[PDB]
Write an enzyme that holds these catalytic residues in place. Structure first.
Site, PDB file in Angstrom:
ATOM      1  N   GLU A   1      -9.250  30.520  -4.335  1.00  0.00           N
ATOM      2  CA  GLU A   1      -8.331  30.331  -3.069  1.00  0.00           C
ATOM      3  C   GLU A   1      -8.869  31.116  -1.896  1.00  0.00           C
ATOM      4  O   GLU A   1      -8.759  30.571  -0.770  1.00  0.00           O
ATOM      5  CB  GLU A   1      -6.993  31.198  -3.525  1.00  0.00           C
ATOM      6  CG  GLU A   1      -5.995  30.221  -2.848  1.00  0.00           C
ATOM      7  CD  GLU A   1      -4.410  30.702  -2.959  1.00  0.00           C
ATOM      8  OE1 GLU A   1      -4.209  31.855  -2.798  1.00  0.00           O
ATOM      9  OE2 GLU A   1      -3.744  29.948  -3.579  1.00  0.00           O
TER      10      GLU A   1
ATOM     11  N   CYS B   1       5.119  29.497   4.591  1.00  0.00           N
ATOM     12  CA  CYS B   1       6.060  30.894   3.877  1.00  0.00           C
ATOM     13  C   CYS B   1       5.605  32.249   4.639  1.00  0.00           C
ATOM     14  O   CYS B   1       6.312  33.188   4.524  1.00  0.00           O
ATOM     15  CB  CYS B   1       6.094  31.019   2.617  1.00  0.00           C
ATOM     16  SG  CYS B   1       6.295  29.497   1.247  1.00  0.00           S
TER      17      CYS B   1
ATOM     18  N   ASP C   1      -1.077  36.373  -2.529  1.00  0.00           N
ATOM     19  CA  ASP C   1      -0.938  36.549  -1.119  1.00  0.00           C
ATOM     20  C   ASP C   1      -1.234  38.159  -0.697  1.00  0.00           C
ATOM     21  O   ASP C   1      -1.704  38.060   0.366  1.00  0.00           O
ATOM     22  CB  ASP C   1       0.519  36.295  -0.584  1.00  0.00           C
ATOM     23  CG  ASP C   1       0.861  34.872  -0.533  1.00  0.00           C
ATOM     24  OD1 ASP C   1      -0.002  34.028  -0.706  1.00  0.00           O
ATOM     25  OD2 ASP C   1       2.201  34.729  -1.003  1.00  0.00           O
TER      26      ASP C   1
HETATM   27  N1  LIG Z   1       1.261  31.340  -0.368  1.00  0.00           N
HETATM   28  C1  LIG Z   1       2.481  31.136  -0.603  1.00  0.00           C
HETATM   29  C2  LIG Z   1       2.913  29.658  -0.806  1.00  0.00           C
HETATM   30  C3  LIG Z   1       3.916  29.439  -1.235  1.00  0.00           C
HETATM   31  N2  LIG Z   1       4.614  30.162  -1.782  1.00  0.00           N
HETATM   32  C4  LIG Z   1       6.001  30.064  -2.649  1.00  0.00           C
HETATM   33  C5  LIG Z   1       7.431  30.711  -2.153  1.00  0.00           C
HETATM   34  C6  LIG Z   1       8.152  29.940  -2.815  1.00  0.00           C
HETATM   35  O1  LIG Z   1       8.496  30.125  -4.074  1.00  0.00           O
HETATM   36  C7  LIG Z   1       7.629  28.330  -2.544  1.00  0.00           C
HETATM   37  C8  LIG Z   1       7.996  27.666  -1.240  1.00  0.00           C
HETATM   38  O2  LIG Z   1       9.131  27.205  -1.373  1.00  0.00           O
HETATM   39  P1  LIG Z   1      10.269  27.104  -0.049  1.00  0.00           P
HETATM   40  O3  LIG Z   1       9.308  26.506   1.179  1.00  0.00           O
HETATM   41  O4  LIG Z   1      11.390  26.279  -0.667  1.00  0.00           O
HETATM   42  O5  LIG Z   1      10.552  28.678   0.076  1.00  0.00           O
HETATM   43  O6  LIG Z   1       6.089  28.662  -2.537  1.00  0.00           O
HETATM   44  C9  LIG Z   1       4.493  31.627  -1.909  1.00  0.00           C
HETATM   45  O7  LIG Z   1       5.139  32.704  -2.455  1.00  0.00           O
HETATM   46  N3  LIG Z   1       3.107  32.047  -1.126  1.00  0.00           N
END
Ligand SMILES: Nc1ccn([C@H]2C[C@H](O)[C@@H](COP(=O)(O)O)O2)c(=O)n1
Ligand SMILES: Nc1ccn([C@H]2C[C@H](O)[C@@H](COP(=O)(O)O)O2)c(=O)n1
Ligand SMILES: Nc1ccn([C@H]2C[C@H](O)[C@@H](COP(=O)(O)O)O2)c(=O)n1
Ligand SMILES: Nc1ccn([C@H]2C[C@H](O)[C@@H](COP(=O)(O)O)O2)c(=O)n1
EC number: 2.1.2.8
Lengths: 241, 241, 241, 241
Positions: free
Chosen positions: A60, A148, A179
């Site tokens: 990633e 997010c 993250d």
């Molecule tokens: N780098 C990322 C990308 C996505 N999400 C996760 C958070 C949620 O579980 C989902 C996004 O859903 P929503 O847009 O419904 O919050 O993806 C995350 O934690 N980190």
């Protein structure tokens, strides 16, 4: 002064409490989650529950460095989680390398570096990931990818660079681990670049403060919270559970 | 569950501690500040230190409703704080009415309302104030106005609508009082609009959680912190002090 | 009497002659230039070759008005020409607003105004941009910025205010256009301020005489000189050329 | 290429024209002058009007070599022109030896020599005589001595070293003769020192280009311009006139 925050250990406790009390919230996919709203904690560990997959995180990272908005450009076989969120053409929004290094997103890394290089005390050292048009862009060509991470602000105090990460939504198990690794990488990078600019700076990485609108665990990971609740172990095999 | 946060009373304590310890940070204007980094608290009072000026907040509200990016459009005599920050033509960035109601900023209010009206459990109900181009726009035509509010997310849980306010920078005395009044107004508006859409929703305003990268008091207001520290009174006259 | 000087048209001719004869001088960056040494002309046009960019000149004016020695303070995206010349912390020397309005450079504008207000015939009305320490300051913290404007003298004769601009070095295409706009601005300002002091003065802007040690065109702009030589047009697109 | 400049003969003509036309300007001492504004000419003769007093010039050279800011240190009886301009303690500003050789004025000669020794094509070879604080220093302790030489730039082209002398103010009769002798001396010196550094340089003194804001004749010398106007002789005795 830095605020007296929760730690990852206390977050674990509150998530375990939420599960114990059946405080469920229905996800957009129809599945249950447990959730902390308005979570703020110092990320003093690199994971909350689950195992550290260094191999995945490095793939990633490579993708972020490429700045590609296409999921096929993730080294090796693209994870199905990225596949199911991608547009009809394989496109997404949430390449964080694109967010901070692309000129298309207004050179967030470089500008934050220039700001802090000129004024170390600045409150304006910030990398803005999301954008107002995200209200319409999140489902472009049928993707499902609403950024997010909102912003990450960098504050240099006592020669330590602290990062205040502001997230809309974060999955406790896969999301936080990935993250966190990314935010730690960028913080170390920024420290390096500022130190390379002037040898008398001698900056050090400080704390990463994690602010999340909805910090949640999906029901498919409840067994991890449950097991930790009983034993204090932060990981089991699904099979050993 | 909503996170177990600090309250405004505890913020007062930590600011008083910072002053007692001479924990000063130098502002861009060259003046001293005391500061809490990565502050997160429930805004359970409408001010931290200082008096409430309902007259001023209503003028700023009217200006936000107009969506004008020009400071002369503030009703009555434009405050000098807005004057000194404006461009050579009297223009600024930080009209929050423009941020959430203008089509130019992608209809943040309307889209967040549509999201929450369709999926009350959504994690994507958010109003995005700042933008990536802020790295360049903050000093357009010689203004000095880098958007201090990043995002505000709205989460409906147990029929209460909670607001998670993410700010880069917030002045404790003038800024918080004005910005809280604004965020409380928008939250009440959003509750009203959702309730008007369906009489069975019966939503109520929940908590406003305040997340700030740098929450600071300028030296010109240290007498307020010092006085409260000695007496517990949240306001004095400068003359009485 | 004002000296019988060359005009901009004649400067164009002499530059075209220098190019026709391959009279090249090697720049410090290793690139070729053509050059007139000890150039003196009346600046009777606002450019020599190239197009007028009012948008850019206004941003540079705003920066000069701010008096900031940091290039990031130029409104909007800082031009790369300013980036490459700046120090490791983004600092430069050649903010002309700082030169004439800062108390740090001994209040050049105000003192020249006071001199001319008291003795309109004075030969001592001068704004001194450069300084003896420039021998050491030009590369402070790794910047590359040796002040190119030395002095500008103002002489009031027959109720017209003439400016004698003394420059060490001036790029014909970008430099002259920007610097002329600046010098014209300051002259108009000075006329205004003197007239505002006494309604019976009735001064008017006179001639701007341009004296340059090295007035040069860089090789990347030779196509402009060559085109004008062939056609008499003072501007082409690089693509059209 | 060096600019096609006026010569001293043409300057004489223009001064004679100014007198013929009664183009007078009132000096700060209340006396009339004739004047050329923004004069630029090649100094191809060592005087404009009057006689060459080699004896006086050598005494002023000796004083410059001493770098003394006190007029009594001029060899022999100090000229009354220097006396009337001196402070209450006998101090002045305009020792040109001090300007280019003192460490107090940042080693102008040595630094210009180092610049041209390292890069012969440089546009940064310059000796800065005046300073921004001259706005306040010109009348220190009641002296009346505002530096009239601003800068002198040296440009090596075709193995000839050209000097571009930028002066604020220059008396045609006494001033130019003395100042020319000085500038010629420094140019020859600089040529010598550069040639001594490397025997393959073989530099030669080039042209001295004279740029003056106000080039003027005082009324007590009008008889010289008048006589030259009638006869073409550049000098008479006051008694023979
Ligand atoms: N780098 C990322 C990308 C996505 N999400 C996760 C958070 C949620 O579980 C989902 C996004 O859903 P929503 O847009 O419904 O919050 O993806 C995350 O934690 N980190
Ligand atoms: N609605 C607003 C607008 C501005 N500010 C304050 C926060 C800082 O005190 C300053 C912005 O400065 P900086 O951009 O340097 O943080 O303005 C605020 O508190 N609330
Ligand atoms: N206001 C300015 C600032 C710079 N320059 C140009 C002149 C030269 O092309 C270069 C400075 O280089 P040097 O110091 O080598 O003369 O910048 C200019 O024309 N005007
Ligand atoms: N080396 C010098 C010193 C002085 N002056 C002359 C020029 C003016 O006649 C006078 C200075 O007056 P002001 O300062 O009023 O120009 O001195 C000169 O020509 N050369």
């Amino acid at each position: 002064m830095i605020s007296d925050s929760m730690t990852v250990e206390e977050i674990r406790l509150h998530l375990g409490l939420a599960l114990k009390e059946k405080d469920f919230v229905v996800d957009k996919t129809g599945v249950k989650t447990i959730e902390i709203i308005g979570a703020s904690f110092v990320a003093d560990e690199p994971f909350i529950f689950g195992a550290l997959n260094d191999e995945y995180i490095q793939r990633e990272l490579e993708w972020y460095k490429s700045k590609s908005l296409f999921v096929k450009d993730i080294p090796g076989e693209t994870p199905k989680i990225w596949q199911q969120v991608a547009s009809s053409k394989g496109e997404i929004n949430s390449n964080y390398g694109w967010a901070i290094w692309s000129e298309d997103n207004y050179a967030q890394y470089d500008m934050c570096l220039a700001e802090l290089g000129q004024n170390p005390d600045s409150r304006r050292g910030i990398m803005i990931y999301t954008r107002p048009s995200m209200q319409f862009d999140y489902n472009k060509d049928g993707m499902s990818d609403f950024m997010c991470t909102n912003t990450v602000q960098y504050l240099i105090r006592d020669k330590k660079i602290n990062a205040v990460v502001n997230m809309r939504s974060n999955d406790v198990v896969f999301g936080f681990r990935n993250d966190y690794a990314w935010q730690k990488y960028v913080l170390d990078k920024l420290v390096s670049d500022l130190n390379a600019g002037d040898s008398t700076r001698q900056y050090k990485a400080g704390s990463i403060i994690w602010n999340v609108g909805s910090l949640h665990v999906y029901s498919r990971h409840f067994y991890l919270v449950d097991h930790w609740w009983k034993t204090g172990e932060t990981h089991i095999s699904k099979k050993d559970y």
